[PDB]
RNA sequence: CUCCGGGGACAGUGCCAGGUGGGGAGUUUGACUGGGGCGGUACACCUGUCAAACGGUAACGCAGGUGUCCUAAGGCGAGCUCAGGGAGGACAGAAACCUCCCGUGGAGCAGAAGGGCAAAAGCUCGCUUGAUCUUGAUUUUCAGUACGAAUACAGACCGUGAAAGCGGGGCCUCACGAUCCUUCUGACCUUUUGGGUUUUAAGCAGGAGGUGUCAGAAAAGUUACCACAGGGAUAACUGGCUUGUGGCGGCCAAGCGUUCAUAGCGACGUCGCUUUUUGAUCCUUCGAUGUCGGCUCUUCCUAUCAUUGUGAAGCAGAAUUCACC
RNA sequence: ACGGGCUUGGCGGAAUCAGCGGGGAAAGAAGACCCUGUUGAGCUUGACUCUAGUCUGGCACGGUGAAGAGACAUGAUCGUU
RNA sequence: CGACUGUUUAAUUAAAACAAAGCAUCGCGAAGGCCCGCGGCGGGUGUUGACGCGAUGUGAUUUCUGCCCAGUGCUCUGAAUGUCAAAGUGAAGAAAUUCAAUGAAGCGCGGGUAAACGGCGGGAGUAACUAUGACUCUCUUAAGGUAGCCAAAUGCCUCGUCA
RNA sequence: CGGUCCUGACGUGCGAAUCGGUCGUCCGACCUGGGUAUAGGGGCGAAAGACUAAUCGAACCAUCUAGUAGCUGGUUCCCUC
RNA sequence: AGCAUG
RNA sequence: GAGCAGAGUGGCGCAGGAGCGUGCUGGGCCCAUAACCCAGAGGCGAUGGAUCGAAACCAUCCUCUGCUACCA
């Protein structure tokens, strides 16, 4: 037979995600002595939507 | 899948549409043919919890 | 059939007829060193897949049975084999049928 | 003295082993055949016939059988005679057992059929294992190859009978299987390799495990998406032979026809014609003879519906039937 | 086994024009239907033989200690596993 | 017949076929699920995290989704007799070798599951005119076709019977 | 942008798929240029076994290869027995 | 525990 | 047409040394009928053959039931 299309999925040719215009990856701040010990503060400047 | 040709499915041909063995696969099936419910512990309409 | 378990027959080491024991023979268990079994062995092993016929096309149902005649003699001990036709049943020192009686 | 945390001798990797594995690979998917397929086995064997009075001789010809069974249903010897029928005897009878008579087989001999058989080849007793070891020759199918089966001897060792003899399977015609591989049996057997001892292994001879497609490859389908080499050796359409069948027409005359076989019909039988029905065949056509209907258009046939000319009616007229050119 | 040619007859007269669709079993394409071949390919599965992958066991990488059940060097310490 | 819009065999088929929203299952909490790769601390989903990704069936709305786990699949627990490779352990033997015990997954054994693949009977008597026959007897299955619908694009008989 | 019907024209054509009238859609799952990614047992497919350079139920190019064919076709002067 | 009918 | 299944008490069925539930009949309990209880009677489709013996085995038939009768 032939390769079936969940199986063509694997080698992502024009199955791979559409990631241009996505504005980031949304990622939690990194560890430091900072938060680890204490706390910072930031302020909220923007809300946007991906 | 049973749209479709054998060639290209492992459900494709006949001439009524029908999957025409069962649907549930093992987990242990080779690419190109673990399609349908994938080791389904059970199927159909659910009954309570 | 019916065959008794003591036959007097003759016998090839003492030259004469001698009384016999009889028993059916039975084959023996496939030896794992023989020249045939060692060199199809080697064949089998690797890739290829079979290598010689296995057959499946069974016809008959029957087996000709073979006898193993002992001569009783306690210094001679030769043994022979006697095939005799094939058939369906067989035991050894059955009880002998007689006739004129009430069924 | 490991950058911080989190796992940790476990994930994991490398090599073997066991499962699973049409995801994928390779291949196979018998023959004969009144086309092929379904069916069947006429594929290996035996009996009667076909078969045309030596032998041989075909079809998916006719009627049947086989892949077994037997410690005796094998081998001797002895003694008896069977199927059936008749006449008698308490229960007892149509049929139980006893007695006499007739009894050429009309019974039986394992099986299908044919042949053969009466102080036996059958039935009953007694003893037994020639259904054992061995080299050759011949017959049957036949190529005068093999297997299978059989025949006549010869050499041992035996059984049986007083003995002559008989007997190395079944009264005869059937009842079965090569190479390679495995297994058992035999020898004060041969080799196991530079010598020797010992296990092992390989040789020689005889049995067994089997190929039923039976002179013996290891083998499931589908293709209406299909391909190639070919075949008129072989189907579907047309043409040809035939005419069961379909259609049409005769001869005979029991009866119908209120009387009256034949105005008109006409049973039981029997004789033909046509190829506008369907069958059977496979001669032409597979390097292609464009398949069913309808439309259009020409011609031909008569087995005459109407029309012209007639003959007969159970033809008064009208109408309707039968027949003729 | 439906001849243009052969046999027996009917018969036959140069060279041409416009149409026509009866016939040349007209042309095209070594029949695509059917059968044969010990020729194939696409596809399938309860065909035969394998196989990627996957599940599991052993060995090596592969260490440091403490307790439990043990074989061990008739109760017990000590050390081999 | 298909909800609709849309799509399709470029060159014989534009369709009732495909898709579609809706509906319903299945797997997976990342050392993961599905998949690619000859190969590596390789790669896609994934600049992702269950209101997600992946695998399927059906096919808008309304009204419903009947019974069957015997068959084949799928899946859940390993201690009763089971079976079961390699390696390792013990014993006999001059050794090759042989024997014995132990013994993983899988298969058996035991549950669950049909919006998994699929399946869903026959024969007789019987009401006070005939006729039907609610009713009864029986054999039988895993269950014996429920609600609906029909000579239908599904019915041989068949140009079924009535209008 | 597409391609229903006339089964019209043409069918050694204008054209190895064109022409006419009639047709479907025409704010969207819309039409389109250039750039870019996916390669042959592979891609890609709103799925027709469709498309992948006039080639697709496995493209094209060279080679193994003068592959095999129990099957079609052909096979070259004379006379004499 | 089973208990229909006129 | 070929293969194949099945004929058995009144009706539906089991099956080498004639029966089941139901039906029917007699008697019980009841005012009476059914239900309930106690008893009883009722017969291998046909032919031929293998067999000491068959309803069961083997052939031919008489019915009936189902499955195929494709490809052009
Ligand atoms: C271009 O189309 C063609 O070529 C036609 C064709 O395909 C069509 C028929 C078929 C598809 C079945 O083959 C074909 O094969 O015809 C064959 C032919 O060639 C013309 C000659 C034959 C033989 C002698 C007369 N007859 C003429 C028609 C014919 C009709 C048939 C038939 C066989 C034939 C053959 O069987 C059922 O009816
Ligand atoms: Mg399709
Ligand atoms: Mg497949
Ligand atoms: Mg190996
Ligand atoms: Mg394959
Ligand atoms: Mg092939
Ligand atoms: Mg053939
Ligand atoms: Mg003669
Ligand atoms: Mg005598
Ligand atoms: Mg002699
Ligand atoms: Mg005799
Ligand atoms: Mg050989
Ligand atoms: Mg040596
Ligand atoms: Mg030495
Ligand atoms: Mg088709
Ligand atoms: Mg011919
Ligand atoms: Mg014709
Ligand atoms: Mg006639
Ligand atoms: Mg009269
Ligand atoms: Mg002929
Ligand atoms: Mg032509
Ligand atoms: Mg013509
Ligand atoms: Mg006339
Ligand atoms: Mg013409
Ligand atoms: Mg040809
Ligand atoms: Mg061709
Ligand atoms: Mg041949
Ligand atoms: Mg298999
Ligand atoms: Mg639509
Ligand atoms: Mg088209
Ligand atoms: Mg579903
Ligand atoms: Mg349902
Ligand atoms: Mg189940
Ligand atoms: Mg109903
Ligand atoms: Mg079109
Ligand atoms: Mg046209
Ligand atoms: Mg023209
Ligand atoms: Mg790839
Ligand atoms: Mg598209
Ligand atoms: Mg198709
Ligand atoms: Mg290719
Ligand atoms: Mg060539
Ligand atoms: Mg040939
Ligand atoms: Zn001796």
Do not use: W
Not at chain 3, 17 to 37: E, I, M, N, R, W
């Amino acid at each position: 037979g032939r390769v079936i299309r969940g199986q063509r999925k694997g080698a992502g040719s024009v199955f791979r995600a559409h990631v241009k215009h996505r504005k980031g990856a949304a990622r939690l701040r990194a560890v430091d002595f900072a938060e680890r010990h204490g706390y910072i503060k930031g302020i909220v400047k923007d809300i946007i939507h991906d | 899948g049973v749209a479709m040709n054998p060639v290209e499915h492992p459900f494709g041909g006949g001439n009524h549409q029908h999957i025409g063995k069962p649907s549930t696969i093992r987990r242990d099936a080779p690419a190109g043919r673990k399609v349908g419910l994938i080791a389904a512990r059970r199927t159909g309409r659910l009954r309570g919890t | 059939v019916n065959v008794p378990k003591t036959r007097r027959t003759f016998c090839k080491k003492c030259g004469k007829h001698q009384p016999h024991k009889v028993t059916q023979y039975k084959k023996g268990k496939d030896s794992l060193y023989a020249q045939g079994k060692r060199r199809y062995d080697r064949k089998q092993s690797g890739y290829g897949g079979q290598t010689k016929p296995i057959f499946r096309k069974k016809a008959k149902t029957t087996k000709k049975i073979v006898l193993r005649l002992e001569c009783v003699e306690p210094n001679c001990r030769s043994k022979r084999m006697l095939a005799i036709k094939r058939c369906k049943h067989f035991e050894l020192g059955g009880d002998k049928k007689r006739k004129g009686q009430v069924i």
